[PDB]
Enzyme design. Sequence first.
Site, PDB file in Angstrom:
ATOM      1  CG  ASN A 143      -1.876  -1.247   1.073  1.00  0.00           C
ATOM      2  OD1 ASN A 143      -2.624  -1.373   0.162  1.00  0.00           O
ATOM      3  ND2 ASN A 143      -1.868  -2.131   2.115  1.00  0.00           N
ATOM      4  NE  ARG A 147      -9.483  10.508  -1.836  1.00  0.00           N
ATOM      5  CZ  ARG A 147     -10.722  10.410  -2.305  1.00  0.00           C
ATOM      6  NH1 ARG A 147     -11.043  10.975  -3.460  1.00  0.00           N
ATOM      7  NH2 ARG A 147     -11.642   9.745  -1.619  1.00  0.00           N
ATOM      8  CG  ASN A 180       7.115   1.704   5.795  1.00  0.00           C
ATOM      9  OD1 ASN A 180       6.381   1.043   6.427  1.00  0.00           O
ATOM     10  ND2 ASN A 180       6.808   2.996   5.483  1.00  0.00           N
ATOM     11  CB  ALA A 240      -0.431  -3.742   6.550  1.00  0.00           C
ATOM     12  CG  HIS A 273       6.237   2.105  10.860  1.00  0.00           C
ATOM     13  ND1 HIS A 273       5.536   1.266  10.024  1.00  0.00           N
ATOM     14  CD2 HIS A 273       6.921   1.302  11.718  1.00  0.00           C
ATOM     15  CE1 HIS A 273       5.743   0.017  10.403  1.00  0.00           C
ATOM     16  NE2 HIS A 273       6.613   0.016  11.392  1.00  0.00           N
TER      17      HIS A 273
END
Lengths: 145, 145, 145, 145, 145, 145, 145, 145, 145, 145, 145, 145
Positions: free
Chosen positions: B11, B18, B75, B78, B101
């Site tokens: 992800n 956006r 990183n 999730a 993170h």
Amino acid sequence: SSTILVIHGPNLNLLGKREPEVYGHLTLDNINRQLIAQAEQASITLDTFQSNWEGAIVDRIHQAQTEGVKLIIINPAALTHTSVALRDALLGVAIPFIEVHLSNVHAREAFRHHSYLSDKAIGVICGLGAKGYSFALDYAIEKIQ
Amino acid sequence: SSTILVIHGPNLNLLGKREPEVYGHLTLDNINRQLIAQAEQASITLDTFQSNWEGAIVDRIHQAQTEGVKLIIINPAALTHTSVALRDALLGVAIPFIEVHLSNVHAREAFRHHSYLSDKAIGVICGLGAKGYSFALDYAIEKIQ
Amino acid sequence: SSTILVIHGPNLNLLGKREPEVYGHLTLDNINRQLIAQAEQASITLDTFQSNWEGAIVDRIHQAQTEGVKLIIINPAALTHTSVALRDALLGVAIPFIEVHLSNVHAREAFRHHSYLSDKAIGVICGLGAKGYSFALDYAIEKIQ
Amino acid sequence: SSTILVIHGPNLNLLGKREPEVYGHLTLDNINRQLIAQAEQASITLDTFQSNWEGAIVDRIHQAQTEGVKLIIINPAALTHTSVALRDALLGVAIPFIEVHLSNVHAREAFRHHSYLSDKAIGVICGLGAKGYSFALDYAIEKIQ
Amino acid sequence: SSTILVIHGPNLNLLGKREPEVYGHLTLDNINRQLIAQAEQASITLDTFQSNWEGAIVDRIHQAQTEGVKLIIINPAALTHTSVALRDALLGVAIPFIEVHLSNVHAREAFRHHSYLSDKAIGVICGLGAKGYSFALDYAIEKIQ
Amino acid sequence: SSTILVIHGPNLNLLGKREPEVYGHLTLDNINRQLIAQAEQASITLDTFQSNWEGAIVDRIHQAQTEGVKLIIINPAALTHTSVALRDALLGVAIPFIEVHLSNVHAREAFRHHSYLSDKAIGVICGLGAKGYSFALDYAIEKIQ
Amino acid sequence: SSTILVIHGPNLNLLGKREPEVYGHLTLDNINRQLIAQAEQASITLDTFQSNWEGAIVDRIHQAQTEGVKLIIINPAALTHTSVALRDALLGVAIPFIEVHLSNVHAREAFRHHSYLSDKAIGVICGLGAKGYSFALDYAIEKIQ
Amino acid sequence: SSTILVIHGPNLNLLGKREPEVYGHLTLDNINRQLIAQAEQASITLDTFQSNWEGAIVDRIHQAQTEGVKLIIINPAALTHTSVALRDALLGVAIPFIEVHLSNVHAREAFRHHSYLSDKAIGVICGLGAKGYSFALDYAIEKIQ
Amino acid sequence: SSTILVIHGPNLNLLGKREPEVYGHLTLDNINRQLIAQAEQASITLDTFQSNWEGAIVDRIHQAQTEGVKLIIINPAALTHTSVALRDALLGVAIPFIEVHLSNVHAREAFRHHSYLSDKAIGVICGLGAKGYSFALDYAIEKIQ
Amino acid sequence: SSTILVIHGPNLNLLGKREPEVYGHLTLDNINRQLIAQAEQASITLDTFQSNWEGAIVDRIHQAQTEGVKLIIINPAALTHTSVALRDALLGVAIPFIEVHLSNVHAREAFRHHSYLSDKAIGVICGLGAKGYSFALDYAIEKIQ
Amino acid sequence: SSTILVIHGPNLNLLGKREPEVYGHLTLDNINRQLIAQAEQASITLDTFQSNWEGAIVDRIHQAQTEGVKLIIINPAALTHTSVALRDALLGVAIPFIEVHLSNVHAREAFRHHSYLSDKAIGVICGLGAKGYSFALDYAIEKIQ
Amino acid sequence: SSTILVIHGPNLNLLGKREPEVYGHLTLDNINRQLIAQAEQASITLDTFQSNWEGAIVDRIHQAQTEGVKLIIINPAALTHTSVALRDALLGVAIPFIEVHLSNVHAREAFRHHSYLSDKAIGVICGLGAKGYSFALDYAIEKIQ
């Protein structure tokens, strides 16, 4: 013929690396040949698979149902504690299985005490190194022949 | 052995998608170019990887062992809270790593407090955004020298 | 008069008063000069503080608000697991802060996992030794702009 | 010059602030004199300290290292359950210690079962009143002869 | 010399510091005057105390016993969740107390639900602001002649 | 066979069966002889008992009631964490007792923290080796009067 | 030479006492004869023991240290979940052991998921019936040369 | 035009195994056809996807955002309980989704009660078999129009 | 109509029924009368209600919204720990409320430490007996006027 | 008479009170009419019931058994997390049921994740608003056929 | 005809040793005679047994079976909360049983609430003193016509 | 005068549904009649009550005090795990009570292990069917005389 499929989870391919003093003289490949020969001696066909991808393992189990595999010997490794998908794959196909761990899993970190597979397996073997696979195979053979 | 690998988890590819903020503009590619430039400036060779598939990341870290890799900046996103396989991969290849993170994980949901990688990492940075990667890189550079 | 404030918790004064085995020679003062120098190079004023008394630290934080401190870099040390009074102090004055630990906290005892400050910090650095303070300052300087 | 240090935590000063209600006639000062005498009889220096402030106790432990205290006998009282800062102070100075409680802690409120210092102490005594301090000293002397 | 004692914990001093509508305009000092006047109206002597140091509060409670204080109204603030030392001070002096909080503690973070004092208070008031202190005083006055 | 009884739980017989550091010279009998001598010196009779069987120990405690035993010093060893029958035996006869452990229970496995007999004992001593038994006796002797 | 001891826990004797319907018809003795024979074929001495009394099993384990037993195969059965005394016995003698269960314990009640022995065993086998003992012996045999 | 995407989880491809009742005759394909027809009847474009690989599903979701999908109907199956990566993918793209389960998940193992998606879904349906998908669809159509 | 509504939960009717030194002499009606008078003195209308049936209380709160009730003072008594329905009733109508208990609930059973209403109330008062109701009313009056 | 019974739990009557902002204009009556019409169209009889009293609902369920009701559609609302009696009522009459919630319960408080009804329902729908009732009805009709 | 066996656990024998009230007068023998007389009247053979040793009780249960015992009434006392072995014995023999306790265990210490035998018993009686035994017998007689 | 009240909780009225499998042919009235007669035979007055509404039961218990009931036999059924109000009602009237359950609760779901009444009852009977009531009555009769 009565095929048996052996499945190796993630990180098992790490076999034997920096051999003296990191509990890895033998290599997965070594473990597989031994197992194939043992099956070969009892007139039973045996295949082995490994992957670091969970989906690859799940796809393999489905294929096993279409191939008439009678019993799976699986070392899920890390997946044992994390994958319900794997559990459902083994349940959905309804092929009986034996769970195997090289190291004693109960002697490690607490999260290693939980398994998504153990309760549904015929039986489990942990901590006996590679012999654990052999023992599972021996049991699986008596069960069928 | 004086190569550094940066791994991005699932992800992360969505960064900057956006339009404007909250947390707009900046992309994964943007972050990668800064890091590569930073590594060149210190004359170190930096390689990056991103994948939404756990297995792909595990294979990569295996590859990293075979190649030059000295240190990994990861990183896991999730995967941090779910993947013991990733933890065994890092442990099995024995390459030292730093956990990064972008956001303050302690500030989010309780399930995000738990990590399968933190205790084994050299160090952890969370909440500083893209700089976190940079900081991990700086340290990593001063660790080889 | 001081733009940036660094706060060291209890037991940090002991740095470098141990061994040549168990830690080297780096002291709390050494760390403070390094930080002061780093800030001076960027034309920012930096103040430091240490105490083994929780109330002294809480008073210091209050004073910081009257003095226009813009950001606080804090290593609460032990207090991180126990003091909500320190959390309410940082919240009450509304000065943004970064939490820093020399050692990797997630590495140690389970009780060290919990913090009363992390979810409200901008970010956290743990396990990178003294460099963590520098990493935090570097970030704070960028941010002060 | 103070060979063995005895530390009394918070509220211990209240001992003997009543007839035979909560306790009997004995006071902290009485306990201290008995202990000093016992140490004098064995040719060992003994110093004592009490405070209601955690930071004062933490400072004293630090001072104890510079002087050369060889063993600490501590009744943390309430802090045993709350202060990891005290634990880190005892660990940081590396002075072995014995934890003492006048009353049986395991017979009171559930929270009082938890301690931030018992796992790291040489031994613990609880519920034997003042004698507990005496027994700890006797043990400390034989340890050091 | 003072019949009722009012104790304010850490960070209460901050009241009314961020004046334009963060916390509102009311200061600790204002609350104290109102309280002093209310007691005077009833011909009762009232004293107040605030500190950010736990040990200072513990020492004050002790002093209260020697001064013949009949009832204590205390807002421990953050300490309510952390200090058993405070609880033991109140219990050790055997002075009855009422616990008071300006904000509704059950409203916020889960950790704030737990109190080391409540079960031993006569009563508790939370979420009514300053009036809570006034209500406690009213009750305390009736309890005493 | 009256006055003070000392009970040793399971595996205590192995003491000194190992000569090397995972034990030492001292044996259970040695401890027994020192304790009998210590009691004889104070004009008190002292009996001792060891067993690996829980029922044998329970039966002995019952016997102790008939024999007019005034206090019991017990090291339940493993039974401390598992036997409510032993707790009921001690409670049923109503003979006050002191719990003793050679090693520091709190420094080992989490399950060792729990005890079915500590909350009802007069007091507990852990971590001080055989001396712990001697301190309990010394306490028991001063109590009888 | 070195000996092998097999220990059976409580209730094992019942094997073969409600024979149908092809679940429990082999008896403990049957298992014992098969194991002996298995041993004699490899020229290793093998001894067996069963009891429903925990103390009897603990005494036997001690006896085993004196007799120079090199390895122990044990099916603790119900005890596996309740007896820390048994754990301590095996630990005190320092004889390595393998845990065996006839049925898959993980497939039953939750309380059966917990074991006081497993973490310390070399390995564990559960759910393979009597073959589990045989597999444990073959591993043990190969262990001794 | 307007797109609705239906995602099927791992093991879903197994629908229709032993045909006359273990589960029914119904297959994933069958379900897909019914759904496509249902959408066509309402002049809505409908795509389907199934995979046994978590990454595959994660990319597909990423693809959906680029593709203008307006709502996703997902049956995560096993992943519901294990994949935060899946949750972040849905959250990162910001496409609203409805969670569907064929079987009543709350009627099975406790570990199935927990979901990483449910709290973020618009709604959830379980236990109504294939109809559940239809209902979801029907809801989805009214929601865009 | 009614500006302020006071609700009493189950068993409150029993007040003053075991007349001797249990409870007191005070009854629920007496408390109602005092409250009604207090409100009249401030020119506010006050209504009261008690029932042992949860549904009756729920219905009453609904009625309250139709009647324009500004604020509810409620003593849920036993419900506070069991009724989410009551919580949802208070939330659904959106009328602000103050929770009141005559006795100190934290001084009793652990299960009484939990409340389905407290986190949503404006404020809580416990342990001050009937005065608690009057204090809640005084606060309510000032809130409205 | 093929009858279906729809039960609504406490606080459902409130639907469509706070008309413009928080929740919409739809009422319980509207939902009931849409459902009756839906049933009439399939030639099935459909009754409905709502109450804020648990007992009334329980009584209603009992009546249903007498009336030959074949399936029950229930929205227990708050009673889902607290009423085992409701659960026992449904089980006692042995009438299959579907559980429906208008909002997404998993999205609300942690206590709302628990249900006394779900594990026994045929299926559950949540978060789809009133349509959730319609979907359940549609399913029930196909089931009775 | 056949028999009913009454089993008594550890510490029962202590019955009747403090007068007048720590439950004075009544002894285990008195109870046994009462039960034997009650059986005789009904022409049923009854045997009894008590031991402080778990293994003795286990052995008796095995011996009960060979002798055709139809029902067992047992008061396991302390063993109810610790002995799975006792559970397996009753289960292995397959003799139905009724659990009895003289005092109300649920009153007692929380650990006392748990039982390894309650779920498998026909029924349980607690808190009714010796009658409890008589009731169980009464029940046992009708059951075994 | 003397009266014993018997109370039956929710769903008890259903006794007698499906005579051959689930349930039995005995009905609540049947039991009632058996209890009334049993009481008459002993010259004791007996009343009974059943309701599916919690409030109704609570009101009955209040009524009982006024009526001079001396003991209550209650089967709270589902209410035992949920109703603290029921508990406070029994405590508030101070009438001693015996708790009865027809089925063995401990043999069912875990949530059924918990009771809000059990610790305060004189005793509890479960799993013995209707006889349980009779046994409670017999005890109640001797208790009165």
